[PDB]
């Protein structure tokens, strides 16, 4: 993995074109996330 930008612990990707998209995030140390919930699902075919 890469390093965080100096003086930072993560990166936030802020969309600037798609007004409806939410943010994306990147961490560079696996210790900075804990997998709290495992969600099992299917995508649903639209009616």
């Amino acid at each position: 993995m890469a390093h965080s930008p100096p003086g930072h612990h993560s990166v936030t990707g802020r969309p600037s074109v798609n007004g409806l998209a939410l943010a994306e995030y990147v961490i560079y140390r696996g210790e900075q996330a804990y997998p709290e919930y495992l969600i099992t699902y299917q995508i649903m075919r639209p009616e």
């Binding site: 990166v11 936030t12 804990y34 639209p46």
Partner: protein, 160 residues
């Protein structure tokens, strides 16, 4: 050392996790190419992931970050999709779970939109889709996402 505890659909915790999953679906610019065509999910199971060692690893790092950032971990709950979800729940996140070619550099990626993380369940760009039918829009095969506690600390803002 991981055990998985099934949550009842009657449990407020199941309900708040499901609501975050469903309410953060959006339309994608690929028209569904990577993740499939859908507006909602059929939730089949939500399990709490319990591993003491992995939790202590997380909280140890969280304290390090907080102390570097005026006692503020900047902790979020975010989605992660990956072909190695079952590895992550047993062994934790590490460099093998990084997206080397991602737009914000080689690191581990998370999304506020559940449907963004859904694009990565079968690999980058959806790969070849589900193993059984080779369909990125499969409505039959079971998928899994992780809903993760993530320490952001001081986060570098990259505009789109």
């Amino acid at each position: 050392g991981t055990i998985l505890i099934d949550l009842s659909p009657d449990d407020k915790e199941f309900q708040s996790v499901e609501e975050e999953m469903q309410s953060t679906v959006r339309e994608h610019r690929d028209g569904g190419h990577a993740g499939g065509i859908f507006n909602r999910y059929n939730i089949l199971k939500i399990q709490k992931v319990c591993n003491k060692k992995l939790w202590e690893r997380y909280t140890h790092r969280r304290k390090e970050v907080s102390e570097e950032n005026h006692n503020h971990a900047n902790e979020r709950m975010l989605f992660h999709g990956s072909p190695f979800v079952n590895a992550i729940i047993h062994k934790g996140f590490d460099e093998r779970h990084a997206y080397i070619g991602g737009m914000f550099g080689a690191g581990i990626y998370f999304a506020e939109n559940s449907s963004k993380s859904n694009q990565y369940v079968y690999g980058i760009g959806g790969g070849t889709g589900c193993p059984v039918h080779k369909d990125r829009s499969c409505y039959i095969c079971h998928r899994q996402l992780l809903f993760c506690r993530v320490t952001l600390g001081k986060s570098f803002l990259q505009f789109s």
